Design a protein around this nucleic acid. Structure first.
Ligand SMILES: [Ca+2]
Ligand SMILES: [Ca+2]
Ligand code: NA
Ligand code: NA
Ligand code: NA
Ligand code: NA
Lengths: 155, 153
DNA sequence: GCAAAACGTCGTGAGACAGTTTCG
DNA sequence: CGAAACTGTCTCACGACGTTTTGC
């Protein structure tokens, strides 16, 4: 696990509080046992003329990548271990997104047990609902209730 | 002048780089010698649900105020002396808005001189043009050329 | 089956001005 | 006069999702 410098973490926490997204999703996908994938993403978006800054984040954080979507680009970090390590170090300095960060860390820690039982999987999905509620969510479709119905129509 | 803690400045520089605006404007106004006001503003906007963070900035920076404009609110710092003191301490940690911050400091230092000569006023107006070019400017109207035309006439 | 990447999109939450007014 | 406040709104630069594909 990479140990990050404190001044970098302080700066990045301010950047993330004002212009970062800590996202948790439940993605319908038939290849999974409970028919959904639990997905977590740390994202930093910038107008494409500033993509260089996002490329530099890839070098500084040491993981992740950047994708382009036209007028803007996004730094994306979704690998679970690196994400846990990064958010663990960043969270003490967050003022606006600390609760989302901690809920993501909680989810990551319970992923192994969530795979073992439908009731635990559903509980972890309610934590995803909690993150969405803290975020400025506007176009969400798959929720813990979507999952509850599927699990019931399976058992 | 207030001396700020480095940890606060590091955090706020990150916040400003991603969600801050360093604004310079030339405002047509007949009560001024050169018929325009040179205006500088440091602004931090948030959805109103998070205006509490802006209210805390007023206490932490120690000057400025919050205004509400519907769905969002803005922390506003326009007083020149406190603005110069604040940006002087914040700029070493800025990575995306350092150029705008330093141009604002330069403008502030030259305000006294800009009021004694048309050419000097215009020179400072060109530094305002530079800040707007660095920003994601989209609805700007009054530029150094606007002023140049007014003064010539 | 699951991690992770790849690709795609609705509706802002800001960003950056503009115009007008106050009062030491 | 002139610094600073008061007030308004256009146009994004994101924010937070969504769906599909890759491959061990
Ligand atoms: Ca923001
Ligand atoms: Ca931004
Ligand atoms: Na919300
Ligand atoms: Na620009
Ligand atoms: Na006054
Ligand atoms: Na893989």
């Amino acid at each position: 696990n990479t140990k990050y410098n404190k001044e970098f973490l302080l700066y990045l926490a301010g950047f993330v509080d004002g212009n970062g997204s800590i996202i948790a999703q439940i993605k319908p996908n038939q290849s999974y046992k409970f028919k959904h994938q639990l997905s977590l993403t740390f994202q930093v978006t910038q107008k494409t003329q500033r993509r260089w800054f996002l490329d530099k984040l890839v070098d500084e954080i040491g993981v992740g990548y950047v994708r382009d979507r036209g007028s803007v680009s996004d730094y994306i970090l979704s690998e679970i271990k690196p994400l846990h390590n990064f958010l663990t170090q960043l969270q003490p300095f967050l003022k606006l997104k600390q609760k989302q960060a901690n809920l993501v860390l909680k989810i990551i820690e319970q992923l192994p047990s969530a795979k073992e039982s439908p009731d635990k999987f559903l509980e972890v999905c309610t934590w995803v609902d909690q993150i969405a509620a803290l975020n400025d969510s506007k176009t969400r479709k798959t929720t813990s209730e979507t999952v509850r119905a599927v699990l019931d129509s399976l058992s």
